[PDB]
């Protein structure tokens, strides 16, 4: 309801722009391999890039050149199963839902904290002002002031502590984007389980 002095600001990048960035990354990695992450993009046919990657994990090229059709079929089926796996699993995106839930909960608590009395006659300033004289109203107003200041301080400290963790997660995601999408990784279990090919 726009709350009481609380507002939400829109992010600088819209969803379309993020989709455009993702599309550019996909096109680059499909038509160039890993060359475009280190300089100008150099074209190469896709089966030859797959041969390069098999050579990178320790297998010779003739294996792929002789099992090309089988490898393509396996890749197609594996991609096809992902949509079904994500389509019918309830707790699939709990990590992304937790952020929204926590933010909504914190805002709701902050708003609800406005109906407390903190040991005063009323939680409304208007009636305190309309039924008391100035020398006696401040003795009630200051208690509300102290309580509401404490509520704001608690909210801000919690927000800072959550922002630190979000930043750590974003740093990890950026490292993964650099090392698993723009190249082929040799670190174990960093870009999936098995011998990494691409992402």
């Amino acid at each position: 309801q726009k709350f009481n002095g609380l507002t939400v600001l829109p992010p600088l990048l819209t969803d379309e722009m993020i989709a455009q960035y993702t599309s550019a990354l996909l096109a680059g990695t499909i038509t160039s391999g890993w060359t475009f992450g280190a300089g100008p993009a150099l074209q190469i046919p896709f089966p030859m890039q797959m041969a390069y990657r098999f050579n990178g994990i320790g297998v010779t090229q003739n294996v792929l050149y002789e099992n090309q059709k089988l490898i393509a079929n396996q890749f197609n089926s594996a991609i096809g199963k992902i949509q079904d796996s994500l389509f019918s699993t309830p707790s699939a995106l709990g990590k992304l839902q937790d952020v929204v839930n926590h933010n909504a909960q914190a805002l709701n608590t902050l708003v609800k904290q406005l109906s407390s009395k903190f040991g005063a006659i009323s939680s409304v300033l208007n009636d305190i002002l309309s039924r008391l004289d100035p020398p006696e109203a401040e003795v009630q107003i200051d208690r509300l002031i102290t309580g509401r200041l404490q509520s704001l301080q608690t909210y801000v400290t919690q927000q800072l502590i959550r922002a630190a963790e979000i930043r750590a997660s974003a740093n990890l995601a950026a490292t993964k984007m650099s090392e698993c999408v723009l190249g082929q990784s040799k670190r174990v279990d960093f870009c999936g389980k098995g011998y990494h090919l691409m992402s």
Partner: protein, 265 residues
């Protein structure tokens, strides 16, 4: 006017946050919805004062018709008002923007505003313009299934990266800060327990960690290696990063520039 089905015995109406949102008129039984009057934040967009004195104003989270109506009736609290030409008011998802002319060119972002909108100072005379941010140059690679591209030359490039390591170590005395040198204040403060011991422990831990950070970053090696007196390495020139013996502190030229570039009771 309200469309709430009040049972014949209620008077007020609340919501989840528990604030009044509906009421009944005593003299004529009728349900009235109550909505708060418009409020929001104000942002000021400016280039440097070295450049110009023109500004633009953003009213956050509001439609432009309401701000125009409030201005015409003189109901808006910030008394100052921008000239508001008929062609320099714009509506964005961040709010109402007054004082900038919207063009339909795309540039690199200069001053962020909102959902993809940026502002800049352009000579087009000089003025402030608003535009949609550009993501980059368009490129398509000539894909084919029997064609390859191979480089025939190279470049040696050098880039820089700057990282913070440590910060300032400070200490605080409770009694001096809170009570000064008053004995009555100290006796009164003694009744609050042991907050000051915790404060001292926290600050001391911070200081020790500050020293440990630098130790971990810089004390990698165990030997002090020295470079030979004759500085010939096959044509490579390392003079800009090697220590300079003429000056007293024995720093490289780049280190001197860095130490003079940072300005600090």
């Amino acid at each position: 006017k309200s469309n709430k089905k009040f049972l014949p015995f209620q008077q007020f109406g609340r919501d989840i946050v528990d604030t009044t949102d509906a009421v009944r008129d005593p003299q004529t039984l009728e349900i009235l919805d109550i909505t708060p009057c418009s409020f929001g934040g104000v942002s000021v967009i400016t280039p440097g004062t070295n450049t110009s004195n023109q500004v633009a104003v953003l009213y956050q989270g509001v439609n432009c018709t309401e701000v125009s109506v409030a201005i015409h009736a003189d109901q808006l609290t910030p008394t100052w008002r921008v000239y508001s030409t008929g062609s320099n008011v714009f509506q964005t998802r961040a709010g109402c923007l007054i004082g900038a002319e919207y063009v339909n060119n795309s540039y690199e972002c200069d001053i962020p505003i909102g959902a993809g909108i940026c502002a800049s100072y352009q000579t087009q005379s000089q003025s402030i313009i608003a535009y949609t941010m550009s993501l980059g140059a368009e490129n398509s690679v000539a894909y084919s299934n029997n064609s390859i591209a191979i480089p025939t030359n190279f470049t040696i490039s050098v880039t820089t990266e700057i990282l913070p390591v440590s910060m300032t170590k400070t200490s605080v005395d409770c009694t001096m800060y809170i009570c000064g040198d008053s004995t009555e204040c100290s006796n009164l403060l003694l009744q609050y327990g042991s907050f000051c011991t915790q404060l001292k422990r926290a600050l001391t831990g911070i200081a020790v960690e500050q020293d440990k950070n630098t130790q971990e970053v810089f004390a990698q090696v165990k030997q002090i290696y020295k470079t030979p007196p004759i500085k010939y390495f096959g044509g490579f020139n390392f003079s800009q990063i090697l220590p300079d013996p003429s000056k007293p502190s024995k720093r490289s030229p780049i280190e001197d520039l860095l130490f003079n570039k940072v300005t600090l009771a």
